[PDB]
Design a protein around this ligand. Sequence first.
Ligand code: TSA
Lengths: 216, 215
Amino acid sequence: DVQLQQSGPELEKPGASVKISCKASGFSLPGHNINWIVQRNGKSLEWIGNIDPYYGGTNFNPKFKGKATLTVDKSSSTLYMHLTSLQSEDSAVYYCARRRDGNYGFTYWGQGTLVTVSAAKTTPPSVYPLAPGSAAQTNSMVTLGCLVKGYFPEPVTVTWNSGSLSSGVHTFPAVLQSDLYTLSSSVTVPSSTWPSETVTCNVAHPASSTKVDKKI
Amino acid sequence: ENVLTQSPAIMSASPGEKVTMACRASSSVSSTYLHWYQQKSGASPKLLIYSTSNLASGVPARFSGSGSGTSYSLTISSVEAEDAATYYCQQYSGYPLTFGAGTKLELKRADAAPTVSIFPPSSEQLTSGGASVVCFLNNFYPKDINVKWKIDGSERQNGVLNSWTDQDSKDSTYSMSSTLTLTKDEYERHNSYTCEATHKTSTSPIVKSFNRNEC
Ligand SMILES: O=C(O)[C@@H]1C[C@]2(C(=O)O)C=C[C@@H](O)[C@@H](C2)O1
């Protein structure tokens, strides 16, 4: 297979250095640049510089110098990035990207490497099940709710029955409600697939070691 | 530097519409390599169009790019609900590589009226603290509403949450949810609570109530 493997998110206080990585895995490494593009919070994209998966090339943006140490180690193939003096607007996501061609604009981008930068304490979610009323409603096909009270930071990932019932998915955003970000997520299940088949909700929150699987 | 601005900031459509936008670039994009990226609601940008005109495998043909040095098209001849996104482009300068601030499309369609439905606020919420009466308004167009509450009567509380969704890729819908947040030391004290929704599809605001039945 091929992939650009990246692992985030890290929440740091203002000052610290998020040691980030990407594993280009699969094509020729010799002739390739993993450009680390950066996407703005509610805004636009822009580019840092790039790093050769073999020798140590760094072509760099005339601004991104100092918060930018892009580096491959020989052995096993991996591309690094290390930003320092993390300040409140680096609070965005990060990418790794790839060449098949001279399409000089990448087909094969990586995952969501996210970074949040703020000095507030971590919170595991408090995932909860909502019941409605034992009733008859609207049109004969039922709506069930799962919500996740305030946690910290975003993200978390809410999921339902993992396969079998990927019903009317709509996951609602969060406000930062004070501190704590808040979620809610929906379904509409056929009134025979539920209650005979329990529908499940599931949540993860990396920076709180969480997994909560909840049954309705 | 070589910087790109591609108005319309936001743009409109209808299934059928021949829609167009422009990667306005500076002087020569030094030999011209133009790439148009569709980012759908918090995701990886995806190449459609790439060595200026070129599209690849994966895309249906709603999509021709083109231009010389300074302007670049993307003919989305016909749109389906999932052309609802942001479309930004990228180039040369003759190194470093700029991108652009992208164009948003919002697919239009004939309106629908909201399905509010209420869920009383959970076993583990109350046993442990407070009550998020959450009410989901699902599958509507045009996204605009006014969702208020009837605390008791139609009491004007504060401390009320909101979340809208993305434009859906199938039905060009939007949906959203509301939460009243309050102490057990108020929820087990006020009796009859309603999410009141107002929208141009009904003459009425729709009012789906509850008063202490279901646990
Ligand atoms: O084609 C690609 O996708 C990428 C981008 C890249 C560049 O310098 O911009 C162009 C050619 C290749 O050397 C590298 C770097 O892979």
